[PDB]
């Protein structure tokens, strides 16, 4: 969470999180959701809407982001770890800005 705050989340339009809490490979998605929804990250753009979609039999933990430039970063995090997901999110911010 601290990494995202320093990197200027103001260039991110919308973030959504779709996961099934009753599954076994959704722990990584939960950690990603809590890091991007932290208070520090929120206080960078008061227009960005974070959506926490919750399903049961969807069986596809996924995260979708849309940047200011207009690119669509969607990563289905089921085998990825929390660090890998956050690091990829951080890398795209600098390139697309």
């Amino acid at each position: 969470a601290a990494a995202l705050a320093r990197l200027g989340l103001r260039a991110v339009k919308q973030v959504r999180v779709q996961f099934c809490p009753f599954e076994k490979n959704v722990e990584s998605t939960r950690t990603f959701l809590q890091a991007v929804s932290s208070e520090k990250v929120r206080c960078t753009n008061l227009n960005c809407s974070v959506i926490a979609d919750v399903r049961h039999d969807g069986s596809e933990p996924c995260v979708d982001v849309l940047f200011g430039d207009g690119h669509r970063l969607i990563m289905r995090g089921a085998h990825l770890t929390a660090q890998e997901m956050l690091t990829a999110f951080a890398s795209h911010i600098q390139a697309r800005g």
């Binding site: 009753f22 399903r55 049961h56 039999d57 969807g58």
Partner: protein, 45 residues
């Protein structure tokens, strides 16, 4: 003991068996017992 499996809405098809046996038990009664069942339910509820 254990609780239920929490079925979802993606493939909701399995209704509880307790309801099904209650339907059969209700349907296995005569119309005279229907009035008795209704009057008792009305008095209680």
């Amino acid at each position: 003991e254990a609780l239920a499996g929490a079925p979802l809405d993606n493939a909701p098809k399995e209704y509880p068996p307790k309801i099904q046996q209650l339907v059969q038990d209700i349907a296995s009664l005569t119309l005279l017992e229907i009035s008795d069942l209704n009057e008792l339910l009305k008095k209680t509820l």
